[PDB]
Design a protein around this ligand. Structure first.
Ligand SMILES: OC[C@H]1O[C@@H](SCCc2ccccc2)[C@H](O)[C@@H](O)[C@H]1O
Ligand SMILES: OC[C@H]1O[C@@H](SCCc2ccccc2)[C@H](O)[C@@H](O)[C@H]1O
Ligand SMILES: [Mg+2]
Ligand SMILES: [Mg+2]
Ligand SMILES: [Mg+2]
Ligand SMILES: [Mg+2]
Ligand code: NA
Ligand code: NA
Ligand code: NA
Ligand code: NA
Lengths: 1021, 204, 205
């Protein structure tokens, strides 16, 4: 067999030819199991005709396709290892995974790939029983192979495939023999299809989804479509089922479509083959259309995922079953009328998130347990929609979104971000066959899923004529779903929905030829009528989602702003091992990949092991389905559910005075969809004790659901009630602190306590309790923070981005400005000691900051610090204005009265509640993989740590890591706990931003721009 | 200018053109025509082909042409001459006053067709007045209607020249042959000769 | 050259695969003449860089692609006649032209064509001056070939084409040698493209 050899098969070079995307590959279709029993098809029991080939395969790695020896087609190589399939081979140490965002990981010369094309040679030896070979068709299904592959069965060449994210099927019935069979798969890392697969993710390769064998009869169901059509009030539905057969037509062949609600049968129909006349030549003799009438169907939504079970039986006229197929059916209609995306007649508000298929140990191989873990965490955090970014997912994902209830945007595997210009391939008709396959085979696979409500043409591919053609193709074959597409400025003719990426709420971004308007402006542009759903917004890179409440204020206010998809769900960090076998989270660059985009792979709301970032609580609160308004004693509760009554909800309210509770109660919620309920509170307590009174309400789900435990909190809100200002005089103690002045220091002693102020630096250098020194570093002003990912942007040491906040802070010298003592005085009062200092921060003769402090140690041992800071108006605005010190104490728990429990920032504090919080010190540090400023708690009135107590109204963070160490360390596993405890206490702190992470995104009301700042602290014990 | 797509023989007529596995083959035939001929001023209308039913591949290729070349209308007859893949209602052999109510692809009369509810496009007959032999009776009825109605903008007579071939009998005398005269079987006999002129371009 | 042989090129059977409509064919474009003088381009005088290959070619008819001998790729067959190109071979008495309106002239089984697929083997021997080979690109333009064809230049496989009514262009600059060149074109009567070419006319090739 010369034509089966590697020298002949590889000479054509099908992976460098966009005109050849497949050879001998079967047609795309919904997932089949080929049940030969209709009751087994109804109850979804596993079919004996669908056989999984997952498990241990033989694997050999090669640097090029030409390096594979000819003997591999007949027998296993001696150097072949045994790997588990599905896997990526970069996760088993054969070459390195590459992380790159925009730049292609190969030389851009389409359609050519490098000759150094890493090649994975898979082989499997397996037995086929002889009953499969006597009759029928046996196909092999590769659910996903990255990137391209040739297939051999028993040394004979079967076919070729591309499009890594959709299933490739090949007929093997002329290739298999009885008994022992060998199956050789040669997987290439790069192909012509890699130019269409430039998604921002780790570039891996291999057989990364399931491999299976399917045995079908000779006359078989080749395709089936379900479509639901409704009347005006959704009380009568028509399930239109279109079944296609292949094989030889017989007049005794029948098709029965039965519809089941659990165990009871709702509708049924039967028909012989032969469609209606559609043109001059007749109709389809090999197709049927069955129309089933359903009276009062239970409608599918993400709130209530009502599913039916449709069973399609191919059988003869006397009644013997040939084949059964089945799919879950949800009755739902998605349409855009009058500029609004409607589901079942109601306007959606998309609480969405982008989700890559990522596992930190297995790369891009997804199992069911991680998918179920993601869906539960999404619904417990008030998400109702997922965008498949940016490729079709594993087929089980759509089934689980049908079952639990999530809207799905299904997206074609087309991204050519790296091209210059971005539409170089998508405006070329020579690439229209390759692009069409990626769209048409997605729609043919996934059109029956009720959770898929929107088709997407891909991501970031410019706007070419191939998008307009593929837009119109989908609208022809599937009118039941809108089509969206972002590229070319988000409002082209190839989209039903304006879908911008990272457009801001109020700020325009006038880029040439693709401007990102503000989303409020974008709706009102002349001639613009479509709804706006952000396909990516609120870039969650590290310590981010500042200003997330501004989006959700705008989403609720404007009807045609129907929400969006947060970028993104999970960090794409991988696991490496250092030297002791200790795992650590790796990002781009850590595998020797070059060039790479470093930490832009980690943008998740959860870590790669699915533990939450603190920004997930902010997303949960802003996306909550109950809105609250307080007016006196009355709470109105507005439901934002569209379809369900609040039948698993009770409102729990509490009133507390500076953290200690005074009154509480529980009210059951009975609120209609989009309705209101007035909750009259009782006569709330009116304590004459000083302090702010706080009302907190919570919506608790008493019963467990499919996706939540009992007692799940789904919504909350807090308000300030009446305040009593403290007019009580301090207790006049009779002791007096004693001031001692040397030429080195001022020394103030009172009882066992002692304070020392260095007269050359001007700072409080040491404090004593008895004979224990309390400080390791003096109490100094701090105007900087360890920069966030939003502060850094796309700036690195080679390419400075001069607009980024960290580059403006470095160029202004904020990180290296030195304090210069201007004056220092110490005075004894009638009841206190008064220390007054003044410092200037200068960089190259330019005074950046001036801080004037006042230390007042009274007879009670309290030290009242008042700080007045002047900031030069021409320097960039400082990241913080506050104090830091390194305490000598390492206590185990941190106690504070303020906003919490989780870390919060001035533009990310709406989810935090004011209460008395008590956490261990390890919970006060957020372990971001790229270390930065973290752990801040805002709105704090009291902080307790060890013997110390601080009072005022301040922001703090408290950790074992200095801001200097967090700035200079690239990974969190390289952080070492310092001696003692670093405390930062800020009067004022800049917002964190997070509209995007590559331009300055901190809005002007969260910048420290006032020029003069004042704050007060009381240090005591 | 008309793309080289006709699948008249298929049952049903859109069996290939509603199949996305044939969309790469159909797109090449359309996109390479437009890339060759878009600079000619005499080309005023693109045509997606002839007699291929109406599938989703026509709608995609319609929208492709409107994107790359907005300067020319696109017409397409298949699927009943008034589908979403045509800018112009272009029926084949629709009569002036008589309806032909075929199931799912009716040929209305051209006066009725313009006035159907929601219909706004112009009507240009892509084939009319079939000139097979001694024919073109009632040709004046079309041209009375073309001049009377503004949205009836004429049409294309089928067709210009007879497709007869030359054979030689026994003395070397040439004679005009039609379908069947070469041993071809099955064939459609004299339906190849529909011209207004003979094959040597002398007039009927 | 095993991969240039007829046993390897024809084993793929590109004419029964609607996913393969061309191999190594250049992009479509408006008609070019490549004038090296702008006044000659303005007055539409004939370009010396556009060379017609019309004229007398060698032709051999075969009932099937499998019946073509391997020696045809290197030298002319002894039974080869001399035909004028452009022509249809049914007008020269090699098989019959078929007239059919609606019914396909083959069995309707897409994308498969009959194994009795009449095959016309064209060949041309021609001289290229060395100035074309020193610099630049030399392409061959087939303005129309009914129905599908494989192309060889000097025994090396160049490419494949379908769509009988539009031009097929192939880069030959890595295939031509100085002096005498041979160009072998194997034209098939039926292909997968014939299912898209069911116009009411004489079916020729
Ligand atoms: O999937 C869409 C993507 O868009 C790009 S914008 C390009 C800005 C950029 C370029 C190069 C390196 C880093 C950022 C974002 O960086 C990604 O995080 C993701 O949102
Ligand atoms: O190019 C479009 C063609 O349409 C067909 S209709 C089909 C009627 C028919 C069928 C079979 C044999 C004869 C006539 C005409 O016969 C042709 O002359 C030409 O107008
Ligand atoms: Mg290819
Ligand atoms: Mg991208
Ligand atoms: Mg082909
Ligand atoms: Mg016809
Ligand atoms: Na809204
Ligand atoms: Na990213
Ligand atoms: Na008129
Ligand atoms: Na005719």
């Amino acid at each position: 067999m010369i034509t089966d050899s590697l020298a002949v098969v590889l000479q054509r070079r099908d992976w460098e030819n966009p005109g050849v995307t497949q050879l001998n590959r079967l047609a795309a279709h919904p997932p089949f199991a080929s049940w030969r029993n209709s009751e087994e098809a109804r109850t979804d029991r596993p079919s004996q005709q669908l056989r999984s080939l997952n498990g241990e395969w033989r694997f050999a790695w090669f640097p090029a396709p030409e390096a594979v020896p000819e003997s591999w087609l007949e027998c296993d190589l001696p150097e072949a290892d045994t790997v588990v399939v599905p896997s990526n081979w970069q996760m088993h140490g054969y070459d390195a995974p590459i992380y790159t965002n925009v730049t292609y990981p190969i030389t851009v010369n389409p359609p050519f790939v490098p000759t150094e094309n890493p090649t994975g040679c898979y082989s499997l030896t397996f037995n086929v029983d002889e009953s499969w070979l006597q009759e029928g068709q046996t196909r092999i299904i590769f659910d996903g192979v990255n990137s391209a592959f040739h297939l051999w069965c028993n040394g004979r060449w079967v076919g070729y495939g591309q499009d890594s994210r959709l299933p490739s099927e090949f007929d093997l019935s002329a290739f298999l023999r009885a008994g022992e069979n060998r199956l050789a798969v040669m997987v290439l890392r790069w192909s012509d299809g890699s130019y269409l697969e430039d998604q921002d993710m780790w570039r891996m390769s291999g057989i990364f989804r399931d491999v299976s064998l399917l045995h079908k009869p000779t006359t078989q169901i080749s395709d089936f479509h379900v479509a639901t059509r409704f009347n005006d009030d959704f009380s009568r539905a028509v399930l239109e089922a279109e079944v296609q057969m292949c094989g030889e037509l017989r007049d005794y062949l029948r098709v029965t479509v039965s519809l089941w609600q659990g165990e009871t049968q709702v509708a049924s129909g039967t028909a012989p083959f032969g469609g209606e006349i559609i043109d001059e030549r007749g109709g389809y003799a090999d197709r049927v259309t069955l129309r089933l009438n359903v009276e009062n169907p239970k409608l599918w939504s993400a709130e209530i995922p009502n599913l039916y079970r449709a069973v399609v039986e191919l059988h003869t006229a006397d009644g013997t079953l040939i084949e059964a197929e089945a799919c879950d059916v949800g009755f739902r209609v998605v349409r855009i009328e009058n500029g609004l995306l409607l589901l079942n007649g109601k306007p959606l508000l998309i609480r969405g998130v982008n989700r890559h298929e990522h596992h930190p140990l297995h790369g891009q191989v997804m199992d069911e347990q991680t998918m179920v873990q993601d869906i539960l965490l999404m619904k417990q955090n008030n998400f109702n929609a997922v965008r498949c970014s940016h490729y079709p997912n594993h087929p089980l994902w759509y089934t689980l979104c049908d079952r639990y209830g999530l809207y799905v945007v299904d997206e074609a595997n087309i991204e050519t971000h790296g091209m210059v210009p971005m539409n170089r391939l998508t405006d070329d008709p020579r690439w229209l066959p390759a692009m069409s396959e990626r769209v048409t085979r997605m729609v043919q696979r996934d059109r029956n899923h009720p959770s898929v409500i929107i088709w997407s043409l891909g991501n970031e591919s410019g706007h070419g004529a191939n998008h307009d053609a593929l837009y119109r193709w989908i609208k022809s074959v599937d009118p039941s779903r809108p089509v969206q597409y972002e590229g070319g400025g988000a409002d082209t003719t190839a989209t039903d929905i304006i879908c911008p990426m990272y457009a801001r709420v109020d700020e325009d971004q006038p880029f040439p030829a693709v401007p990102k308007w503000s989303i409020k402006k974008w709706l009102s542009l002349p001639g613009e009528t479509r709804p706006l759903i952000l396909c990516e917004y609120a870039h969650a890179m590290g310590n981010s989602l500042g200003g997330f409440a501004k989006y959700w204020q705008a989403f609720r206010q404007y009807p045609r702003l129907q929400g969006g998809f947060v970028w993104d769900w999970v960090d794409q960090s991988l696991i490496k091992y250092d030297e002791n076998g200790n795992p650590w989270s790796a990002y781009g660059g850590d595998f020797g990949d070059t060039p790479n985009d470093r930490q832009f792979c980690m943008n998740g709301l959860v870590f790669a092991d699915r533990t939450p970032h603190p920004a997930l609580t902010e997303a949960k609160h802003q996306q909550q389905f109950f809105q609250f308004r307080l007016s006196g004693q009355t709470i109105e509760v507005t439901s934002e559910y569209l379809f369900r009554h609040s039948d698993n909800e009770l409102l729990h309210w509490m009133v507390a005075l500076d953290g200690k509770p005074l009154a509480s109660g529980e009210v059951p919620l009975d609120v209609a969809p989009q309705g209101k309920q007035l909750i009259e509170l009782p006569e709330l307590p009116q304590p004459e004790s000083a302090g702010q009174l706080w009302l907190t309400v919570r919506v608790v789900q008493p019963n467990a659901t499919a996706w939540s435990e009992a007692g799940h909190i789904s919504a909350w809100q807090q308000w300030r009630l009446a305040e009593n200002l403290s007019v009580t005089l301090p207790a006049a103690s009779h002791a007096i602190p004693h001031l001692t002045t040397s030429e080195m220091d001022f020394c103030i002693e009172l009882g066992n306590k002692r304070w020392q102020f260095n007269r050359q630096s001007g700072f409080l250098s040491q404090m004593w309790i008895g004979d224990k020194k309390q400080l390791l570093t003096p109490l100094r002003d701090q105007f900087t923070r360890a920069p966030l990912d939003n502060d850094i942007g796309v700036s690195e040491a080679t390419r400075i981005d001069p607009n980024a906040w960290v580059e403006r802070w470095k160029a202004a010298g904020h990180y290296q400005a030195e304090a210069a003592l201007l004056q220092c005085t110490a005075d004894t009062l009638a009841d206190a000691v008064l220390i007054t200092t003044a410092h200037a921060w200068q960089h190259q003769g330019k005074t950046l900051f001036i801080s004037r402090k006042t230390y007042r140690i009274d007879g009670s041992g309290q030290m009242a610090i008042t700080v007045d800071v002047v900031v030069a108006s021409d320097t960039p605005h400082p990241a913080r204005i506050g104090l830091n010190c390194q305490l000598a104490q390492v206590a185990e728990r941190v106690n504070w009265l303020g906003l919490g429990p989780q870390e919060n920032y001035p533009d990310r504090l709406t989810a935090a509640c004011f209460d008395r919080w008590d956490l261990p010190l390890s919970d006060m540090y957020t372990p971001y993989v790229f270390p930065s400023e973290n752990g801040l708690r805002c709105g704090t009135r009291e902080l307790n740590y060890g013997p110390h107590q601080w009072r005022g109204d301040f922001q703090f963070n408290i950790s074992r890591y200095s801001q200097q160490q967090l700035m200079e360390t690239s990974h969190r596993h390289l952080l070492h706990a310092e001696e003692g405890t670093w405390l930062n206490i800020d009067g004022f702190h800049m917002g964190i931003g997070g509209d995007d992470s590559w331009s300055p995104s901190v809005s002007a009301e969260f910048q420290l721009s006032a020029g003069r700042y004042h704050y007060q602290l009381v240090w005591c014990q």
